[PDB]
Design an enzyme around this catalytic site. Sequence first.
Site, PDB file in Angstrom:
ATOM      1  N   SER A  78      46.763  23.757 -15.166  1.00 43.03           N
ATOM      2  CA  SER A  78      46.366  22.811 -14.453  1.00 43.03           C
ATOM      3  C   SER A  78      47.002  21.666 -14.697  1.00 43.03           C
ATOM      4  O   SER A  78      46.994  21.084 -15.991  1.00 43.03           O
ATOM      5  N   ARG A  79      47.693  20.828 -13.886  1.00 43.95           N
ATOM      6  CA  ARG A  79      48.399  19.475 -14.184  1.00 43.95           C
ATOM      7  C   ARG A  79      47.360  18.738 -14.398  1.00 43.95           C
ATOM      8  O   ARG A  79      47.531  17.727 -15.168  1.00 43.95           O
ATOM      9  N   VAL A  80      46.711  18.379 -13.210  1.00 44.36           N
ATOM     10  CA  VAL A  80      45.588  17.448 -13.280  1.00 44.36           C
ATOM     11  C   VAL A  80      44.550  17.674 -14.634  1.00 44.36           C
ATOM     12  O   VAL A  80      44.200  16.667 -15.252  1.00 44.36           O
TER      13      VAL A  80
END
Lengths: 468, 499, 53
Positions: free
Chosen positions: B366-368
């Site tokens: 997950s980049r967030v």
Amino acid sequence: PITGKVTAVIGAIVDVHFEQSELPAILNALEIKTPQGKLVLEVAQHLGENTVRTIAMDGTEGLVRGEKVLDTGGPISVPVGRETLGRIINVIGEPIDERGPIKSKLRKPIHADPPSFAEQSTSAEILETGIKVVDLLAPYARGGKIGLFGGAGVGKTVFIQELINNIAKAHGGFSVFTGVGERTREGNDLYREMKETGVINLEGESKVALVFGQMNEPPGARARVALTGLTIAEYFRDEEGQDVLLFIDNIFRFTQAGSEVSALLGRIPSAVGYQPTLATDMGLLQERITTTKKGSVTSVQAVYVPADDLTDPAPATTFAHLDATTVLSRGISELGIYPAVDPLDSKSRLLDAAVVGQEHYDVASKVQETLQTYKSLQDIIAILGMDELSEQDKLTVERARKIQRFLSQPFAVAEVFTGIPGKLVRLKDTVASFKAVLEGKYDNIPEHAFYMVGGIEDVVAKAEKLAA
Amino acid sequence: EVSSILEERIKGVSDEANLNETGRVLAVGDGIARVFGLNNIQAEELVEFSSGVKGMALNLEPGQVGIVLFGSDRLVKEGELVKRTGNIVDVPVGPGLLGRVVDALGNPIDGKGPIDAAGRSRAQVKAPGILPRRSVHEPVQTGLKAVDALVPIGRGQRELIIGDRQTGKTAVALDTILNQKRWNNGSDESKKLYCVYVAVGQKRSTVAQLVQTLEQHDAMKYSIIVAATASEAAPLQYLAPFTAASIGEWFRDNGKHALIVYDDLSKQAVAYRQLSLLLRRPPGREAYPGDVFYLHSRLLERAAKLSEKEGSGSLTALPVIETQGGDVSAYIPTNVISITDGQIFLEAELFYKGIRPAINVGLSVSRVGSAAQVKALKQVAGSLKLFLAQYREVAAFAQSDLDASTKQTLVRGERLTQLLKQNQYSPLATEEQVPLIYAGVNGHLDGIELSRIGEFESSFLSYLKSNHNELLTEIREKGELSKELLASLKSATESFVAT
Amino acid sequence: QGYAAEISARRNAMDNASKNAGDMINRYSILYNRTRQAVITNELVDIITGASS
């Protein structure tokens, strides 16, 4: 008043029927007055019978046939000026920074023809950089194409940010970061971040200009963002004499956008699903990237290859244009190095003996040999034991791990991010540092005296400070 | 009776049928009527046949206007009058669709009354701008402990649930929806995520089971199910996520948060393939239309967390992509992966080995990520990421005489893997995720026998609930883990470990 | 003395084997990937021809 009525809206391919002898020329820009403001269609064929076939830039959803169109008369003219730096601009040359109408001087066509053979660079030039890894193993070059590889975030974008800072010192240059297939959320962060790190200051000075071309924007507008951006850069280069560095994002999304437009135009997409006019599309764009007599554009491009296939024709075409490739490694970021740059996978073709200077070359070759040996030696040295190093080998290991630490050199933009003020290192002084390290003047000086420092002068200070 | 009410309603239609522009089918084959008329028609506009068929008008050609029929061809025949409704597709939007399974048009396929919702707003509208967004920071907690820790999710973002066919892909998704009941009960309307499940190509029996399960767990009252079932036509399927997105916009615009799960865009792709081919537009790479990238991208950037001037709201999304052979290399997966911001890739082997969740930890990112992670859970599961990393390397060390460190890792890691099992269709509370992981971090669980991990877990939770639900509620409400709480937790775990 | 060397050799050989097999894995994988592209292309050509006619 050259006008014509819409006679088709099959996809975003809108055929317009013009009254006789009042026909636009190919690549002209048509504006259809709409409650969408305007829809800009670019004439991409003449179908005859006083009808044309055009492509759309703005979406054609709910278009009504027979609507009058007005012909601008030529490829879209986008605002340019020093004023226009610090504007997020959409394809149609209108503010998407939302800080109101772009303050403009002149406006200029988005399509432009590559400068003549004479006005192409007759002899190579090495654009200055401040990242030591860059300045040794892949020195930037004016008019060059430098293709980024490796993840974004702490990777590419921070690297790009550093370059803007460096460029401002280096020349006083400007930039235009053009982002194709840009995730608008990520772009917002980048804009806000760029504001925060002050490369954009609209309460101050904004060097970089932003052109963000979201993926939701139609493929035609995806194709045209690049041509627009290059024109802005060219106003700086040719007509303000500037040397600039123009970032481009993914050329996968450049290809992807173009490929669709070809297919829509009915042109048979060549193998690996890539347009028949693939070569020409790169060719026009990347022959406008050059050192002119007036200025020089230089372009840093981001080369995202689909599926890691470099065998794919679009990446191959990119590599033909690429003069350097910068291959950021995440392993390197994990070795506590910001630079995240992988030195052994970073290569430039402008690195040749005469090209970078014989001294610079010889030093570079030695550093390459040192690193190459260090890695290879470390492979079986770790397994065998560190005490199985020869006196020569552990001299090299001692030197090498000192070089590994020497790679660490914070970035000016990353002053906040690493917490350490960046160390800008000029190219000549980078060579000087490595000459001394090769001569082991700093092989009696600790490893982390090289950790997070810049050039030769910087590591004099740190050598003393590490001890004291 | 009821019949009388219908007859009264029929008496209530008598409207002047002065159809400014009518059409006549010239030829109808393949659900591609070519109509003569419709001079001033807007593109994609809704058209009503004599057969009563609904359509969109993808091709506006000069001689003929090529309607694409939403309806079946069964009643359609040449010459059919084609009334021009004169309205591009719109669907009711509003809180009226809470606990309502509706088709794309808006008809309640569950028949839970004619949909009365705030407004009907058009299906396609362009995605929010740069400045109309503000960065994500608000978590969303799916109840799936592994999801919440390994790949913490936030609001107004996209992140895949890409995995192999019929691994109960829908089951993994459904678990998130169920946990949203807890938060839904909660007053704050960011905590009220009004979920939208978009069942694409899913047979009506399957969706009936889904509906029934949702009803069992009383989830139909924040849930909305947009349904384009297996039978439902390829135009409906094509416009189905777009239609769904608009429903989401009312919530988003109202500043609330909500979660839209597009399941599966792979079947959306096939419908577009069918459409493109029927309009004889060349099929792109892997015989999936060339503008599939464009299609998916147009949809997927509508998932966005708006700015605080745009009343801090969102439409969180979690697209589901079906990987035919597990090939993320497949053209539609590769494209989608590029478009989105994170992916979770369930591992078939793990599923087979009964590890449900079956998440492939490496192939989930997950980049967030930790920006949208509960601080308490962040503290006590930074360690977990590193431990699992070692455990992966020491997985192959399961083939034995091993270094003591390695053997310890193997034990600690195995207990952790079992801990992150969570029986399908049973979410967990965050205030109970955090103590358990803390124990594992402190290696308390390492000692506990693998079989007794399960017994330990439920017991530990009750033990904690009895001993200090003051702590649990404090942990829950603070949302952070203070040194004093972690201290008490280590002690508490020791006490439980003794029993 | 022999037995320890024997088992040591068995380990060494079996390690180097894993490496050699890996190299060959990579070589046939690249070939596989190219071959995959070619199949797609050949199919694509058939479709293009069909559409054309």
